[PDB]
UniProtKB/Swiss-Prot annotation, chain A:
Belongs to the peptidase M67A family. PSMD14 subfamily. The lineage of its organism: Eukaryota, Metazoa, Chordata, Craniata, Vertebrata. GO terms for molecular function: endopeptidase activator activity; K63-linked deubiquitinase activity; metal ion binding; metal-dependent deubiquitinase activity; metallopeptidase activity; proteasome binding. GO terms for cellular component: cytosol; cytosolic proteasome complex; extracellular region; ficolin-1-rich granule lumen; nucleoplasm; nucleus; proteasome accessory complex; proteasome complex. The modification Phosphoserine is found at residue 69. The chain holds residues 156 to 310 of 310 of the full protein. Widely expressed. Highest levels in heart and skeletal muscle. Its EC number is 3.4.19.-. This is 26S proteasome non-ATPase regulatory subunit 14. Keywords: DNA damage, DNA repair, Hydrolase, Metal-binding, Metalloprotease, Phosphoprotein, Protease, Proteasome, Ubl conjugation pathway, Zinc. It comes from Homo sapiens (Human).
Curated annotation (Swiss-Prot), chain B:
This is 26S proteasome non-ATPase regulatory subunit 8. Transmembrane segments: none annotated. There is a cross-link at residue 63 (Glycyl lysine isopeptide (Lys-Gly) (interchain with G-Cter in SUMO2)). The chain holds residues 235 to 350 of 350 of the full protein. Component of the 26S proteasome, a multiprotein complex involved in the ATP-dependent degradation of ubiquitinated proteins. This complex plays a key role in the maintenance of protein homeostasis by removing misfolded or damaged proteins, which could impair cellular functions, and by removing proteins whose functions are no longer required. Therefore, the proteasome participates in numerous cellular processes, including cell cycle progression, apoptosis, or DNA damage repair. Belongs to the proteasome subunit S14 family. Component of the 19S proteasome regulatory particle complex. The 26S proteasome consists of a 20S core particle (CP) and two 19S regulatory subunits (RP). The regulatory particle is made of a lid composed of 9 subunits including PSMD8, a base containing 6 ATPases and few additional components. Interacts with DDI2. Interacts with TASOR.
Length: 155, 116
């Protein structure tokens, strides 16, 4: 949020130039400031419009956010830190699984209005088996490639 | 007998005489049979006596068996000694996998990222 404003000669407005404070700006409409913009836009100031100038040198500068020549791919988490991770998740899989069977028996015997408003204990449904598998997998696959890649790279 | 290596197939190449035209032509096969037999024996044993090798490849003489113990490259001590070529150098290197398995992993990623 960033606007711009310029006062307008309120005196000249009273004198008949009230429909004569219209400089030719484009437009795009505002509201929540209609508080003081109803005599702001239409008595005290008006709305200028904002732009930017996205240089290519500044853009190639900010674009930087990671120095990776020591980050991933030249590293990999600890292989005893990484089994303790799998352990936990793939057990949570079990807990959620059971509730998943209990949800597939319910949904069958109910109309979508009652499965719609079902927002008590979101732990039951698909949403958490997906939430998991995509972290688990991710991890691991790549978990996966990192080991292999280094075997040839630092061969 | 040919497809599943069983021998006694050189013996039955003169016993299939009920039709003589069989015994005229089948003689050709007997030069492949010796080759497969020695192909397995190159791995199956490591010390046998010489006269036994003469009894296995279906030769009668010692001379022939010298020539064929020279083509495969064996030595002629008191018993005909073998060279280990079954698993001379093991596949104890997953450095050879290395690149290939990394290709595979990448592939899985492609299937989990593609827009389907």
């Amino acid at each position: 949020v960033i606007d711009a404003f310029r006062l307008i000669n309120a005196n000249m407005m009273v004198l008949g130039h009230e429909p004569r404070q219209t400089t030719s700006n484009l437009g795009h409409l505002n509201k929540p400031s209609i508080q003081a913009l109803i005599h702001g836009l239409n008595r005290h100031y008006y709305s200028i419009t904002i732009n930017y100038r996205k240089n290519e040198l500044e853009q190639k500068m900010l674009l930087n956010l990671h120095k990776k020549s020591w980050m991933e791919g030249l590293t990999l988490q600890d292989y005893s830190e990484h089994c303790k991770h799998n352990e936990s998740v793939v057990k949570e899989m079990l807990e959620l699984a059971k509730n998943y069977n209990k949800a597939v028996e319910e949904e069958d015997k109910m109309t979508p209005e009652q499965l719609a408003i079902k927002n008590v204990g979101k732990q039951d449904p698909k949403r958490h088996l997906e939430e998991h598998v995509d972290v688990l997998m991710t991890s691991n696959i790549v978990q996966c490639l990192a080991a292999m890649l280094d075997t040839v790279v630092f061969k | 007998y040919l497809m599943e290596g069983s021998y006694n197939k050189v013996f039955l190449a003169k016993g299939n005489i009920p039709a003589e035209s069989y015994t005229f032509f089948i003689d050709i096969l007997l030069d492949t049979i010796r080759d497969e037999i020695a192909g397995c024996i190159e791995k199956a044993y490591e010390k046998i006596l010489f006269t036994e090798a003469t009894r296995i490849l279906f030769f009668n003489t010692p001379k022939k068996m010298t020539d064929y113990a020279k083509k495969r490259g064996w030595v002629l001590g008191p018993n005909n000694y073998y060279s280990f070529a079954s698993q001379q150098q093991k596949p104890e290197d997953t450095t050879i996998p290395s690149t290939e398995l990394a290709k595979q992993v990448i592939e899985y990623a492609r299937q989990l990222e593609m827009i389907v």
